[PDB]
Amino acid sequence: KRTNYQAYRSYLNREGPKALGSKEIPKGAENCLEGLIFVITGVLESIERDEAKSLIERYGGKVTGNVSKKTNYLVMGRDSGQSKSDKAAALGTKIIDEDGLLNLIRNLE
DNA sequence: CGACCTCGAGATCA
DNA sequence: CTCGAGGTCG
Numbered sequence A: 001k002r003t004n005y006q007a008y009r010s011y012l013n014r015e016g017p018k019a020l021g022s023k024e025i026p027k028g029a030e031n032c033l034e035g036l037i038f039v040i041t042g043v044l045e046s047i048e049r050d051e052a053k054s055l056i057e058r059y060g061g062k063v064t065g066n067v068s069k070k071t072n073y074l075v076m077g078r079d080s081g082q083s084k085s086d087k088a089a090a091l092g093t094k095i096i097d098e099d100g101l102l103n104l105i106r107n108l109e
Numbered sequence B: 001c002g003a004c005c006t007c008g009a010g011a012t013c014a
Numbered sequence C: 001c002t003c004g005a006g007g008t009c010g
Helices: A008-013 A049-058 A083-091 A098-108
Strands: A037-041 A073-076 A094-096
Touching: A037 A049, A037 A083, A073 A083, A073 A098, A094 A098
Parallel strands: A037 A073, A073 A094
Antiparallel strands: none
16 A cells, blocks of 8 residues: 655645745744644645644644644645544634744734 | 536545 | 545636
């Protein structure tokens, strides 16, 4: 079942973090994301799951692969998981992108 | 006739 | 979360 599927994935889902390590991870208040739960699904413009997690975790925010009732903000860029999006939509969770997540931190600074 | 983006169900993890 | 199958733009 395993193979070099990551090879044709570029054309498939248009994945490939371009500006990784020189765009993300701001200098905003560490307490910024400290309050709500940040759930990032799929992939955004250009970010690694680890880089997003490292950002949220450091900012006192919690991150999980399963949307919760206290999420409030669901980060979703290029994903197809309707099953997970359905939960968030029913809860009243808003969908944000890469900049959307950073915008919160960009506001506090 | 060739490239590309959306629904979807099964493992993932609080 | 992370492959899974399809129909339309090209």
